[PDB]
Structure 1
Amino acid sequence: KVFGRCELAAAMKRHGLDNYRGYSLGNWVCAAKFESNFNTQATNRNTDGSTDYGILQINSRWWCNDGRTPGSRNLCNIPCSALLSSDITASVNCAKKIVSDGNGMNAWVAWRNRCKGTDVQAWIRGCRL
């Protein structure tokens, strides 16, 4: 499923992500734009055999089990295919675990490179929330 900006903003807000561990909603919508371009099915097959899965491109070496990643851990206790569904819940629940462990939203390179330090409010422009 591909989400539009406001549709995803709304769904993320429904899932309690606004101000989660100090990160306002615009951060999460900015991170999903540059990680996956709002696509729940995006996958990026990496160098040491891990793959990033879903709207928020969560990595299989530490967070989910896909059965083929070299020294993998399954900290969110899920199959990586749960992160590829049209409904965002397994991705937001694993993302809340990531931000609570590894240094806030720095875990997402696209947030850290493209969103960090900009005015993220813009990403909720025009969405009545």
Structure 2
Amino acid sequence: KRFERCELARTLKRLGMDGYRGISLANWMCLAKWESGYNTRATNYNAGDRSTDYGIFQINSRYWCNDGKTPGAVNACHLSCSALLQDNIADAVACAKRVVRDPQGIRAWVAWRNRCQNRDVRQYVQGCGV
């Protein structure tokens, strides 16, 4: 499923993302936009370390979810990576919350640093009624 901008903004808001650990909804939108283009079925294979990035937030299998094919990986969100490929993003959001509960926070995603950190992300939630 490829969410429409505002559709996703309200979806994230309903799931408790707005201001979760100090992160505004606009930042989460900016993350999803650059990570997957709002696409829940997005996946990126990293041939170098044999891990795969899953879903709307492109969450990595080495640490966050289990796919049974990433060497010496852990499953911190205690989810099968399949859970991160559903149209319903509740499980993915629970995992994204787990990710930011770590020391880096939203900085865990290099894409957020490159495309959202110290940028104007207001645009992502304008007109969405959030």
Query: What TM bracket, shorter-length normalisation?
Result: over 0.9
**Paired-residue identity, %:** 60
- The answer to whether structure 1 residue 79 and structure 2 residue 62 are counterparts is no
Equivalent-residue separation in structure 1 for 2:29 and 2:103 (angstroms): 19
Note the C-alpha offset of 1:71. 1.5
Question: In structure 2, do the counterparts of structure 1 residues 113 and 60 end up closer, same or farther at CA, with 3 Å as the change threshold?
Answer: same
Report the AA paired with residue 15 of structure 1: L
Q: 2:61 aligns to what?
A: 60
Q: TM-score, normalised by structure 2?
A: 0.97
Q: TM-score, normalised by structure 1?
A: 0.97
Larger displacement relative to structure 2 (113-122 or 23-32) = 113-122
SS state at 2:66 partner: coil
Equivalent-residue separation in structure 1 for 2:15 and 2:128 (angstroms): 16
SS state at 1:44 partner: strand
Equivalent-residue separation in structure 2 for 1:22 and 1:73 (angstroms): 26
Q: 1:15 aligns to what?
A: 15
Instruction: Name the one with the larger strand percent.
Output: 2
Equivalent-residue separation in structure 1 for 2:105 and 2:113 (angstroms): 10
Number of residue-to-residue matches in the alignment = 129
CA RMSD, 1 decimal:
0.8
Q: 1:2 aligns to what?
A: 2
Unmatched runs of 5 consecutive residues or more in structure 1: none
Note the C-alpha offset of 1:119. 2.1
Unmatched runs of 5 consecutive residues or more in structure 2: none
Note the C-alpha offset of 1:102. 4.0
